Design a protein around this ligand. Structure first.
Ligand SMILES: CCCCCCCCCCCCCCCCCC(=O)OC[C@H](COP(=O)([O-])OCC(O)COP(=O)([O-])OC[C@@H](COC(=O)CCCCCCCCCCCCCCCCC)OC(=O)CCCCCCCCCCCCCCCCC)OC(=O)CCCCCCCCCCCCCCCCC
Ligand SMILES: CCCCCCCCCCC[C@H](O)CC(=O)SCCNC(=O)CCNC(=O)[C@H](O)C(C)(C)COP(=O)(O)O
Ligand code: SF4
Ligand code: SF4
Ligand code: SF4
Ligand code: SF4
Ligand code: FES
Ligand SMILES: [K+]
Ligand SMILES: [Zn+2]
Lengths: 115, 238, 115, 96, 176, 60, 129, 209, 95, 263
């Protein structure tokens, strides 16, 4: 499945010796939080599409290096790092919740910048 | 010298020879600099493991240029977003490993050496032709034509009095400056003068992070962690 | 149109409240500031100059505006407390070097075309 | 040349010279009032009037690119001469 | 294409550790630093004996300004105000008036040499090569007012550095 | 403990002064922002102005 | 349509106390709102489409030195552009400036016919072409 | 090539940017008012001021955006609008090699949620915006003047602030201290009205009102 | 003011490299400061025919920024395809 | 009911019948470049720059004189029109003298500005330019007749708004010169207005001649007091001095002219 890399190169990004399960558990938590999102939101369908590809993607390939190459996300440690961000984004997305229509149409000439 | 639409005037005859002569011995002079410090026990102890920043910390703090390169982040506008003819020259970006002062100083020295190869390629591949865009409405016409033809005189007159009106729009270009990601948010309005020229300062976000990098280090290391900062104080203050 | 979200204060009452302790925070340290900066001027003319600056900003009748001067005065207090302003910056409030500009119409007519 | 003023001060080619009662003169005391001597108004007069057998001429001030932009003067009025605006050199048709 | 600048792991064999220990106790990289300072001591200093040996310049050098005149003698400036219009720092002030003889020149042409940025934009804008930046760069003065040149001082410069400015533009006009 | 870098000791009004000048007139300002990166500064401004103008410089 | 602790702020915007302008330059200055007329030397109209804001001129003496046009009024070169009179007239008292407004002068449409140049009866027949 | 002077234009980048512009527009219709791709392949997103934090957070954290570097934060002062200030965000995505522009609007008296939480780089950029223009930001840690001198009055970059300023400085010997005086320029700034009265670009001909 | 060989051996040994080959001072290899006059070329548009400005106006072909969505299944789309990972240098991988 | 409909650049425009193409283009906002066509004076056609392409029409029409009719799409920015404008200006700048640094019209010259917008960026005229002897028409009007483009604006103004017939065109071909033949001062209370209508520096003002530049003067609107008409004028001031009093436009009081005593 690939030898344990001595370092990730990036400072602070510690090497994850067990990255496969970490990706699987976080991705399941992604679809978990997306459950609290009603269907109508474009955020739900898009994020589910991204994660569902990724979830069936991490489980298929057992090797780390083929996973990193095919994921197109750099080192594996970045993938858990970004998947964590997607988790926090979806959680705080639930608060603001931008499915609602535009809060206020701007003034007539706020945009349109020839002076 | 560098002006919109090219350069002011062509190189004086015989300049490329002097550039080649100077670049020939500059490799030795670089070795002169780095030999007395790179392995010097006093130097490393004064910079190693000092001003260490993480990867995500540097990205969030707006750090750019060497500071991303010096701490593992493989980013360089000369390769990712090539401007001018930077897509034709070959060079190596010196990614750092530890991220402290010593790694970035090494990245600076290596970036010094790598520029020599880019200098070598530019000297050996300099093409013939003009030095300004062949369009009088943007670049001024040649002095020989300005004293000879009607259109050149009028364009020279209007270009040096009013200037070239630019289309109304806003842009943000950036280049791999020798310190960071120097850029300008230029906003026009269709007139001959800019409406707003915001100047991206590579040192601004750099100096904003000085408190983060100085956390815990002794005061005598504050000079080391601003030395690797490379804050020229005409850019931060603008 | 007639309604816009506020800064800190919801009406004039709490806006006036934030002025009072700002004046309190400005009264107390004036002798301390005079001692700190080796002010030539005594304490007494320091206190009313704070009073006069607070007095000239009296016609304001907008909660959003009063918040802006309140926070701006706070920075001015902050700049003075942690020796960010020197003697020259403090003496700037006392307009000393410039001659008094007369207010009668006759004097203005004598000196220039100033309306 | 240079004409001295009645107060005893050199007059510039522009005609500038401080009045006797002008206070803005103490600057010149213990110093010297910078004035050029080669009055271009005079020196251009000494240039001979060139005579060419053509209705129009082209003057560039000599030196090609080193001179003024090329202009064409219409030497048709036999009453007077045609002078280039940039440099001031005169031209005249010899009895047409 | 990236290269790892600092990813060298020292060897742990008995030879390498002793060399590092020998380097530590018997200061070697410090001696190498010392040994090279001695090398520069015996070298050739690059100092130029100012003011007996002035530095090397180029014909394009921008220094003290001067108004030149035609070979006839009449000034080149015809007061088109291009130099004043393009001056980035607005250091140029020009006032023109019909001359007595006809063809008219400036009555006031003042350059504020403490406001000038020496960008050279004036000499490019000039369509008659009237205002130029001469080769002189040693016009430092004791008083601020002496810097504020007017037409007379500039015309004097044109009649002083003409023997040098003429040659410079003679060598550089083809490039422009 | 904290490092508060008070800046503004050389806050020349470059961004406001640029507005009042033309695009060619504003060129020398960028040489005077970073005292050491001269052509690099002008290169950024030149690229910005060329991008708005939809005009490219010659290969030389 | 925005519940952000909305309160009634009916009173007119009075940001003057925040712009830092000294007391003198805030009352005794009379700004003018006008559409600039075309430069009569030229014939183009692309400079008469935006409302301009300008401050009344003040003293302009001559230096004891070479004699530039000195001044002591900072609000001398300040010219602002507005796309509509209402926006322009609103920016004045919001900043607290006494103003006078001159309505835009629209060149009235004039009927022009080439055939009139050669008229059988009317005195509009030209004598040269 | 038939266009040796005209800058070449990329359509593939235009399509990719346009597709992403629609992507962000559908994701957060609560704030995204309008979106446009400029001719030189640059994307601008026009959000409502309340969406300053949510929109930036999405661009910073979404797996398909990953814009993780605030290049700069500036505003353009346009007095002719009701909300004269126009705050502009510039973000760069290292993973996807692209840049985005997020712009809001704000009048004189309105606080904007400081983006220090999302981008810690904004912290110092926020102070410049307040100092130069006067836009106050709520929840900012240490909002104070950054560039202007201590006890400075007004906001310089505002279009209604004179270029020369209101006050100059001088060492007064009577008080033996540097003092401030009303400005008195030796030579007034000669303003140059150099706008040609002939239309420049018919493409941006604003339709008549 | 090229020094004695005794110094050259000492100077070279003290630095550890041949310094006489590449020196910090320019003796004669510089280009002469009096160069022959140049003949600058012309731009591509320096033509007497078929060179109308309407076909080469860079400024007049800048359209206004096209809007894609305005307030007044579809695959998720990234702003641009993710960058390829940089490969190690070949001239000198590890410094 | 009479309003016929036209398509200025495709956009529908309601125009009074008998309206010229140029005014129809102005209705949308596009200003057709012009030299001879002055709104107050008659329409001549010597300019040839008002040329524009009418859709599905092979011949470029002169917008200064052509009356529109039903369903016309005035393609202002069509390629054929742009080639026409470049060609016409090339002829204008063929014999124009290189006087821009010494011409008072510099900075406010219609020929200069229209060259920047609708015109080429060089010249292919490797010939010898023409030169015309100057004429004297009084101590008020600078006459450098070599710069004239024979737009006949001065001729039209003299015979229409002034009433005196002394300005005309003598000779044919390229040698045609506009002037007064026999030497005679063009004197009238509206004589100075020929300075304004002239699009080039051929006719300029002697009293102000080469004392300032248009880009450096500050224009201040005011009202003339010399006469009782109260003509609106634009007083141009630079460095606290008065150089020019230019007329303003009011369309009721002074139209676009001022008296010589006013100027
Ligand atoms: C240890 C020091 C031993 C004594 C000095 C020996 C020395 O360096 O002689 C120069 C001589 C050449 O030095 P260099 O730097 O190669 O010269 C380069 C150019 O030729 C240099 O070219 P140049 O034209 O400049 O050379 C001319 C120069 C030559 O100057 C000399 O030779 C000075 C030394 C001799 C007197 O003379 C001058 O410039 C005239 C002014 C002299 C200044 C005062 C000298 C005082 C000497 C000591 C006095 C007592 C204390 O040294 C050697 O050849 C090696 C000497 C090794 C001695 C080892 C003893 C154990
Ligand atoms: C130590 C050296 C420097 C020493 C010098 C230091 C001088 C500067 C010190 C800081 C001054 C500060 O900025 C002032 C500010 O923010 S706000 C002033 C009061 N303006 C308002 O509060 C608006 C509404 N006005 C009212 O509420 C009423 O006018 C009143 C206050 C009377 C209460 O009325 P009630 O009773 O109804
Ligand atoms: S070199 Fe000096 S005088 Fe000439 S344009 Fe530049 S700033 Fe003005
Ligand atoms: S650019 Fe030359 S000719 Fe024109 S005003 Fe300046 S000095 Fe005189
Ligand atoms: S009339 Fe116009 S084109 Fe002719 S010289 Fe004067 S400014 Fe130049
Ligand atoms: S003198 Fe002027 S107005 Fe008269 S025809 Fe010539 S250009 Fe036209
Ligand atoms: S405008 Fe119709 S021909 Fe001159
Ligand atoms: K005219
Ligand atoms: Zn001549």
């Amino acid at each position: 499945a690939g030898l344990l890399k001595k370092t990730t190169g990036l400072v602070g990004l510690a090497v994850c010796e067990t990255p496969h399960e970490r990706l699987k558990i976080l991705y399941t938590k992604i679809l978990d939080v997306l459950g609290q999102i009603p269907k109508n939101a474009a955020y739900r369908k898009y994020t589910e599409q991204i994660t569902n590809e990724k979830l069936g993607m991490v489980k298929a390939e057992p090797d780390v290096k083929k996973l990193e190459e095919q994921l197109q996300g750099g080192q594996i440690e970045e993938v858990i790092l970004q998947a964590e961000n997607e988790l926090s984004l979806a959680r705080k997305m639930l608060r603001w919740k931008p499915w609602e229509p535009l809060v206020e149409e701007p003034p007539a000439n706020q945009w349109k910048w020839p002076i | 010298y560098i002006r919109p639409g090219g350069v002011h005037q062509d190189l004086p005859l015989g300049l490329l020879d002097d550039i080649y002569e100077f670049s020939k011995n500059f490799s030795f002079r670089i070795d002169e600099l780095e030999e007395m410090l790179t392995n010097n026990r006093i130097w490393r102890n004064r910079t190693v493991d000092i001003g260490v920043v993480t990867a995500e910390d540097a990205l969030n703090y707006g750090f750019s240029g060497v500071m991303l390169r010096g701490s593992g982040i493989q980013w360089d506008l000369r390769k990712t977003q090539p401007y001018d003819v930077y897509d034709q020259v070959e060079f190596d970006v010196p990614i750092g490993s530890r991220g402290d002062c010593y790694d970035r100083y090494l990245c600076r020295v290596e970036e010094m050496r790598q520029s020599l190869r880019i200098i070598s390629q530019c000297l050996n591949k300099m093409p013939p032709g003009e030095i300004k865009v062949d369009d009088a409405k943007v670049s001024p016409p040649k002095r020989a034509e300005m004293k000879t033809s009607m259109e050149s005189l009028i364009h020279h007159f209007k270009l040096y009095t009013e200037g070239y009106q630019v289309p109304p729009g806003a842009t943000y270009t950036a280049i791999e400056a020798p310190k960071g990601e120097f850029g300008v948010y230029l906003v026009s309005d269709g007139s001959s003068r800019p409406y707003r020229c915001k100047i991206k300062a590579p040192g601004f976000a750099h100096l904003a992070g000085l408190d983060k990098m100085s956390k815990g280090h002794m005061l005598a290391d504050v000079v080391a962690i601003i030395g690797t900062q490379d804050i020229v104080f005409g850019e931060v203050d603008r | 149109g007639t309604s816009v979200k506020p800064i800190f204060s919801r009406d004039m009452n709490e806006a006036k409240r934030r002025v009072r302790e700002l004046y309190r925070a400005w009264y107390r340290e004036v002798p301390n500031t005079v001692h700190l900066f080796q002010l030539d001027i005594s304490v007494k003319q320091g206190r009313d100059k704070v009073r006069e600056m607070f007095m000239k900003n009296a016609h304001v009748t907008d909660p959003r505006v009063v918040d802006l001067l309140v926070i701006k005065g706070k920075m001015e207090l902050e700049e003075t407390i942690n020796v960010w302003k020197q003697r020259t910056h403090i003496m700037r409030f006392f307009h000393e070097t410039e001659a008094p500009r007369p207010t009668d119409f006759l004097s203005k007519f004598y000196v220039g075309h100033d309306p | 040349g240079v004409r001295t003023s009645p107060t005893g001060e050199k007059v510039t080619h522009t005609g500038q010279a401080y009045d006797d009662g002008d206070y803005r003169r103490v600057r010149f005391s213990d110093r010297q009032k910078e004035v050029n001597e080669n009055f271009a108004i005079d020196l251009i007069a000494e240039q001979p009037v060139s005579e060419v057998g053509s209705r129009v001429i082209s003057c560039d001030g000599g030196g090609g690119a080193l001179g003024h932009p090329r202009v064409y003067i219409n030497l048709d009025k036999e009453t007077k001469t045609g002078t280039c605006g940039y440099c001031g050199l005169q031209f005249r048709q010899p009895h047409h | 294409t990236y290269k790892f600048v600092n990813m060298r792991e020292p060897s742990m064999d008995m030879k390498s550790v002793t060399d590092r220990a020998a380097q530590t106790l018997l200061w070697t990289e410090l001696v190498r630093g010392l040994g090279m300072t001695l090398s520069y001591l015996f070298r050739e200093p690059a100092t130029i004996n100012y003011p007996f040996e002035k530095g090397p310049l180029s014909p394009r050098f921008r220094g003290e300004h001067a108004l030149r005149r035609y070979p006839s003698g009449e000034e080149r400036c015809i007061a088109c105000k291009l130099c004043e219009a393009v001056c980035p720092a607005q250091a140029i002030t020009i006032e023109a008036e019909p001359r007595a003889d006809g063809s008219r020149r400036t009555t006031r042409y003042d350059i504020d040499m403490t406001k000038c940025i020496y960008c050279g934009f004036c000499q490019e804008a000039c369509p008659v090569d009237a205002i130029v930046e001469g080769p002189n760069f040693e016009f430092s003065t004791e008083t601020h007012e002496e810097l504020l040149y007017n037409k007379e001082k500039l015309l004097n410069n044109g009649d002083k550095w003409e023997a040098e400015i003429a040659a410079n533009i003679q060598a550089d006009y083809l490039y422009r | 403990r904290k490092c508060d870098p008070h800046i503004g000791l050389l806050h020349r009004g470059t961004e406001k002064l640029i507005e009042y000048k033309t695009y060619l007139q504003a060129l020398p300002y960028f040489d005077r922002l970073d005292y050491v990166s001269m052509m690099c500064n002008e290169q950024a401004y030149s690229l910005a102005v060329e991008k708005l103008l939809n005009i490219q410089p010659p290969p030389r | 349509t925005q519940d952000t602790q909305l309160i009634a702020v009916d009173e007119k915007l009075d940001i003057t106390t925040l712009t830092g302008v000294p007391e003198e330059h805030i009352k005794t200055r009379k700004v003018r709102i006008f559409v600039p007329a075309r430069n009569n030397m030229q014939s183009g109209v692309n400079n008469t489409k935006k409302w301009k804001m300008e401050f009344d001129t003040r003293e302009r003496w001559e230096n004891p030195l070479m004699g530039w046009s000195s001044t002591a009024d900072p609000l001398s070169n300040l010219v602002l552009t507005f796309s509509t009179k209402e926006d322009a007239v609103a920016f004045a008292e919001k900043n607290g400036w006494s103003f006078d407004v001159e309505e835009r002068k629209v060149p009235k449409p004039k009927s022009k016919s080439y055939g009139a140049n050669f008229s059988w009866n009317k005195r509009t027949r030209v004598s040269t072409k | 090539d038939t266009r040796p002077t005209i800058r070449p234009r990329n359509d593939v980048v235009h399509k990719q940017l346009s597709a992403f512009g629609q992507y962000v527009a559908e994701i957060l219709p609560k704030y995204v008012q309008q979106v446009q791709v400029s001719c030189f392949n640059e994307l601008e997103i026009f959000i409502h001021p309340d969406g300053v934090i949510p929109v930036l957070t999405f661009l910073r954290d979404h797996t398909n955006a990953q814009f993780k570097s605030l290049a700069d934060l500036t505003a353009v002062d346009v007095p002719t609008r009701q909300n004269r200030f126009e705050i502009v965000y510039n973000l760069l995505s290292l993973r996807f090699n692209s840049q985005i522009r997020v712009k809001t609007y704000t009048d004189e008296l309105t606080p904007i949620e400081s983006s220090v939480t999302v981008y810690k780089a904004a912290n110092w950029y926020e102070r410049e915006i307040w100092d130069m223009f006067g836009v106050f930001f709520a929840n900012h840690p240490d909002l104070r003047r950054i560039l202007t001198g201590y006890g400075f009055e007004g906001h310089p970059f505002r279009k209604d602030f004179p270029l020369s300023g209101y006050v100059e400085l001088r060492y007064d010997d009577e008080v033996k201290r540097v003092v401030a005086e009303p400005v008195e320029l030796a030579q007034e700034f000669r303003k140059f009205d150099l706008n040609s009265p002939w239309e420049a670009f018919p493409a941006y001909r604003q339709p008549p009102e | 003011a090229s020094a004695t060989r005794v110094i050259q051996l000492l100077r070279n040994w003290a630095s550890g490299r041949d310094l006489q080959a590449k020196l910090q001072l320019r003796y004669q290899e510089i280009s002469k400061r009096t160069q022959p006059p140049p003949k600058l070329p012309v731009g591509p548009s320096h033509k007497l025919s078929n060179n109308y400005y309407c076909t080469r106006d860079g400024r007049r072909e800048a359209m206004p920024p096209s809007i894609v969505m305005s307030s007044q299944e579809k695959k998720a789309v990234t702003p641009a395809p993710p960058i390829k990972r940089w490969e190690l240098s070949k001239d000198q991988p590890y410094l | 009911s009479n309003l016929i409909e036209v398509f200025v650049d495709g956009q529908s425009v309601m125009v009074e019948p008998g309206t010229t193409v140029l005014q129809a283009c102005e209705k949308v906002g596009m200003q057709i470049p012009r030299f001879c066509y002055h709104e107050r004076l008659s329409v001549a056609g010597n300019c040839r720059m008002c040329l524009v392409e009418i859709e599905k029409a092979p011949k470029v029409v002169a917008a200064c004189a052509m009356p529109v009719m039903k369903g016309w799409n005035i393609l202002t920015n069509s390629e054929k029109s742009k080639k026409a404008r470049e060609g016409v200006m090339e002829f204008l700048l063929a014999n124009h003298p290189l006087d821009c640094p010494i011409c008072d019209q510099g900075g406010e010259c219609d020929l200069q500005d229209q060259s920047m917008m609708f015109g080429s960026d060089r010249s292919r005229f490797l010939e010898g330019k023409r030169a015309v002897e100057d004429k004297n028409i009084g101590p008020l009007v600078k006459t450098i007749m070599t710069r004239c483009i024979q737009c006949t604006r001065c001729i039209r103004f003299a015979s229409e708004i002034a009433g005196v017939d002394d300005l005309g065109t003598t000779g044919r071909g390229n040698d045609m010169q506009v002037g007064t033949y026999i030497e005679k001062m063009f004197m009238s209370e509206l004589s100075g207005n020929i300075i304004d209508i002239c699009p080039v520096g051929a006719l300029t003002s002697k009293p102000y001649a080469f004392t300032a530049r248009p880009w450096e003067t500050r224009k201040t609107e005011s009202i003339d007091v010399m006469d009782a008409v109260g003509s609106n004028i634009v007083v141009s001031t630079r460095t606290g001095e008065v150089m020019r009093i230019l007329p303003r436009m009011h369309e009721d009081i002074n139209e676009e002219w001022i008296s010589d005593k006013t100027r």
